[PDB]
Design a binder for this molecule. Structure first.
Ligand code: ZN
Length: 274
């Protein structure tokens, strides 16, 4: 009946937050050991140490579609790399309460954020995405591993998901519910993207324009603008406020400034599937 409650991955030891359905025999041990590259989960330090000496993987499988300095993102199709993506989903489930899919990964593509050094590309976080979403979900599950959280990596993944959406010529929204950190990070990302635009744009633009510029839904733009006191309802119309001074102030607060890392669309090499 004992669940996996602690993992070792790369050089990190991390306590679990939630039940993840690793095979029962894996929960029995004190710790679960994961190869930081192929995500294979193991029962013993000895088998982990042996595996590390043998495993040839130094990065996620699939295609490296983004690269800038020591940051890379890999796109991994669930159909082409089933085992990896299963390993990934079981890992993620330790830290996500509401993720319900671990084994049927074929309908998903996964985007793995990594930081890269001489050794290899080290996993920081990911988001999964349904290959077919009539509901307009541009993210299914999103997560940064605990030691990396609240450092700009979550908002990077969020940004990346909208850059894909932009290239798809469509608005997107993450599947609900989000973690508390998820909600907070989306709000801060939207705020930053919008303030940046409202700072620059000289002409007039509506919420409709903003949505098409960012792939953020009108609903999310509106709630974001409302919390920033940058919109009013007048004669049955949402009207954006100008006030360029407030914009500058907002862009300086910790809550809404440019994150420490950002997505350079020039470094994104990706075309939507036809
Ligand atoms: Zn391995």
């Amino acid at each position: 009946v004992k669940y996996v409650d602690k993992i070792h991955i790369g050089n990190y030891e991390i306590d679990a937050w939630y039940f993840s359905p690793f095979p029962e025999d894996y929960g029995k041990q004190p710790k679960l050991w994961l190869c930081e590259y192929c995500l294979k989960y193991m029962k013993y330090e000895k088998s982990y140490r042996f595996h590390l000496g043998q495993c040839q993987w130094r990065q996620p499988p699939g295609k490296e579609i983004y690269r800038k300095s020591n940051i890379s993102v890999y796109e991994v199709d669930g159909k082409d790399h089933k085992i990896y993506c299963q390993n990934l989903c079981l890992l993620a489930k330790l830290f996500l309460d509401h993720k319900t899919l671990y084994f049927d990964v074929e309908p998903f593509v996964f985007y793995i954020l990594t930081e890269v050094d001489r050794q290899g590309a080290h996993i920081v976080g990911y988001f999964s995405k349904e290959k077919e979403s009539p509901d307009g979900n541009n993210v299914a599950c999103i997560l940064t591993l605990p030691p990396y959280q609240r450092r700009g990596y979550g908002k990077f993944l969020i940004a990346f998901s909208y850059e894909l959406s932009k290239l798809e010529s469509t608005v997107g929204s993450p599947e609900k519910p989000l973690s508390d950190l998820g909600k907070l990070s989306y709000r801060s990302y939207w705020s930053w993207v919008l303030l940046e635009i409202l700072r620059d744009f000289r002409g007039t633009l509506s919420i409709k324009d903003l949505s098409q510029m960012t792939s953020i839904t009108q609903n999310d733009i509106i709630s974001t603008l409302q919390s920033l006191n940058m919109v009013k309802y007048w004669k049955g119309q949402h009207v954006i406020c100008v006030t360029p001074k407030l914009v500058e102030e907002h862009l300086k607060s910790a809550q809404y400034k440019k994150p420490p890392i950002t997505v350079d669309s020039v470094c994104l090499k990706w075309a939507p599937p036809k």
